[PDB]
User: Fold this.
Amino acid sequence: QLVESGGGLVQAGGSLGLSCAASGRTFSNYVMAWFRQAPGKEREFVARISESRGTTDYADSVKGRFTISRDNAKNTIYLQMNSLNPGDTAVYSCAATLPAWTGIIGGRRPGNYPYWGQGTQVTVS
Amino acid sequence: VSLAKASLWTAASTLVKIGAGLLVGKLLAVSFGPAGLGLAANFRQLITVLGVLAGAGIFNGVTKYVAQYHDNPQQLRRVVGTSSAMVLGFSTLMALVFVLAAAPISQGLFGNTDYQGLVRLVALVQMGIAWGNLLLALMKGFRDAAGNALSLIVGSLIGVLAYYVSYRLGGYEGALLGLALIPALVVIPAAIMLIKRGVIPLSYLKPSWDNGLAGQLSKFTLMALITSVTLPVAYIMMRKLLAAQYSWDEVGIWQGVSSISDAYLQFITASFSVYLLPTLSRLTEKRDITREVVKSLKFVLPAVAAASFTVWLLRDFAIWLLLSNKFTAMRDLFAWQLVGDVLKVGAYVFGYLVIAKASLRFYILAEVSQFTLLMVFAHWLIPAHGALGAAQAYMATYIVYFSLCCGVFLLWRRRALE
Ligand SMILES: CCCCCCCC/C=C/CCCCCCCC(=O)O[C@H](COC(=O)CCCCCCCCCCC)COP(=O)(O)OCCN
Ligand SMILES: CCCCCCCC/C=C/CCCCCCCCOC(=O)[C@H](O)CO
Ligand SMILES: CCCCCCCC/C=C/CCCCCCCCOC(=O)[C@H](O)CO
Ligand SMILES: CCCCCCCC/C=C/CCCCCCCCOC(=O)[C@H](O)CO
Ligand SMILES: CCCCCCCC/C=C/CCCCCCCCOC(=O)[C@H](O)CO
Ligand SMILES: CCCCCCCC/C=C\CCCCCCCCOC(=O)[C@H](O)CO
Ligand SMILES: CCCCCCCC/C=C\CCCCCCCCOC(=O)[C@H](O)CO
Ligand SMILES: CCCCCCCC/C=C\CCCCCCCCOC(=O)[C@H](O)CO
Ligand SMILES: CCCCCCCC
Ligand SMILES: CCCCCCCC
Ligand SMILES: CCCCCCCC
Ligand SMILES: CCCCCCCC
Ligand SMILES: CCCCCCCC
Ligand SMILES: [Cl-]
Ligand SMILES: [Cl-]
Ligand SMILES: [Cl-]
Ligand SMILES: [Zn+2]
Assistant:
């Protein structure tokens, strides 16, 4: 249901653009999010865009540096990553779920997203 | 106090627990659909297992020995102290195993590691499950059907409220946490009711160790261990026989019948541990035990038969109300299954006697008898009649088993081996 594109070996400080495409039909009703998983740690929240007012949420480590956006015309979501530091090296995965799965304050928990992508590697030299 | 009055209290608490479960289950279905249900299946079965595992399965022994020593303050304190130590010690060990292996546990429950935080929370919730079930088992040792029922009623109602706040706040994972909190929140009213009703002094619950009583309560741990394998194994390879010659649809028909029949049995015999187990624990003379067993059978067999006949008459309504309309072919299985249930309830009367006497040896013999009979009948009837044969095998199994229970009781009562 989700496929990822972008990423690879990037020099520290350079920009990077990840994109995620979704299949199906009803897309504007799914909350969209980015998660990442570094070698040795668990899945951590990165960014999230809502299905309604277009609200965004960012982990404090990527706020100001990373920007998530969505386009309901092509059913894709994007993640712009500027000022990449070595701590950003991880496998990045997009996730989809209905707003009832996130609730009021559960939008950061990866277990609240049952639909996942394969993950794309991002290595910041 | 009597088995009938205890049934009246226990039916009210069980009906509220059923109504609360149906409410929470439908809230979960509407909120998260089949994807949420499929991901919650293992986690929910773990919550069921923890209801016995969190306190190392000593609960029936707690009830048995509290009843035996309810007029012995010195031994009663030792019983409750050792039980508290065993529940505290095991629940603490369980909490450590859960938090340390939260990633492998999440993988086995949900298929990925994204639920480690929920598993670590469950490590603390199961302490409330273990401690709440201990307090209820204490009340049952005193035959306090009202305290037990009032505790469970308050716990169910606060559980529904907690589930609502939990899933509204934290979405799907909050909903799962609320599912684990349903059986844990009973500890709050159970503790209040136990102290307020003057059943025991609060100090009895301070952990202590008595080697003798610890070994005796361990017998009930061993019965819990045996029970969690034998007949579950039996139903597993009953489903195997079913799938070997029939479709998964027929397998679902039988599993639906069995699971709803088991819930029916748990509702019907819920007062057995509240009244029958402590009463038979206190009685030691064969005349007194026989009188209580006969009186119990004279009450429970006509009551369960009348209730099961009513259920069979309304089997189409029971299917439409309790189960998802995806089979509607289980109606033909109800009659056989319900007959087996009536005789199984009768067989429970002898089974709780074995519990009341802490007879590990008769417990093993009762379990192996049920397993082997179920296997002989299933291996005969399932390959020929599918899910209907599985229901027939279950019924034939407990016709023979109840008769065997009567015969073995008669030999024991007349002291055939002496
Ligand atoms: C010492 C105490 C013993 C207590 C025993 C209590 C027995 C009565 C229990 C009743 C509770 C459940 C009532 C269900 C009624 C079902 C009636 C019925 O028609 O049953 C048959 C099969 O019966 C059958 O196959 C019935 C077979 C019955 C065989 C066992 C008889 C009792 C043995 C006792 C041994 C100690 C199947 O009917 P269906 O095809 O579902 O519907 C047909 C509609 N026209
Ligand atoms: C013999 C049985 C005894 C039962 C004892 C308990 C009785 C009290 C009943 C409690 C309520 C059960 C849950 C209600 C949810 C209805 C949702 C209805 O859903 C709807 O309306 C939409 O269709 C959902 O898609
Ligand atoms: C599944 C068995 C897991 C056994 C794990 C043993 C761990 C080692 C420690 C020993 C204490 C075991 C206490 C008895 C647990 C039985 C659960 C019985 O659960 C049940 O009966 C539920 O109702 C099943 O739905
Ligand atoms: C020693 C092994 C032999 C086991 C024989 C069965 C004994 C039944 C009672 C055992 C108490 C331990 C589990 C407590 C969970 C009850 C939750 C509350 O649920 C209830 O009380 C509802 O009424 C269930 O329908
Ligand atoms: C000290 C006070 C007096 C107690 C003296 C004896 C204590 C231990 C005996 C427990 C009583 C069990 C009686 C048999 C009932 C039938 C269920 C047994 O299940 C069966 O029928 C199996 O098929 C047996 O094979
Ligand atoms: C039960 C053995 C047959 C398996 C049937 C699978 C259906 C779901 C699992 C357990 C059924 C318990 C009642 C369902 C409503 C949930 C009550 C509130 O939820 C809970 O707190 C329970 O702990 C969930 O298990
Ligand atoms: C054939 C004997 C059984 C007939 C039972 C008729 C009602 C008898 C009166 C009260 C006992 C109700 C126990 C069933 C609750 C099942 C909830 C849990 O349900 C479930 O989890 C379903 O899977 C939902 O799809
Ligand atoms: C295991 C099937 C019933 C076993 C019947 C054994 C009868 C003879 C032994 C002693 C009496 C205990 C009656 C209840 C045991 C099952 C409780 C635990 O209940 C369960 O775990 C049910 O699976 C819940 O659905
Ligand atoms: C408290 C005694 C009640 C007697 C009637 C019971 C009817 C189900
Ligand atoms: C019969 C009781 C059904 C559930 C009521 C829940 C109230 C919060
Ligand atoms: C210190 C007591 C530990 C008890 C562990 C469980 C024994 C059945
Ligand atoms: C989370 C509470 C578990 C039970 C604690 C009991 C302390 C005596
Ligand atoms: C878990 C151990 C609690 C204290 C036991 C004391 C025995 C005298
Ligand atoms: Cl009854
Ligand atoms: Cl003993
Ligand atoms: Cl002995
Ligand atoms: Zn003994």
User: Anything to note?
Assistant: The CA atoms of residues 259 and 265 of chain B lie 10 Å apart.
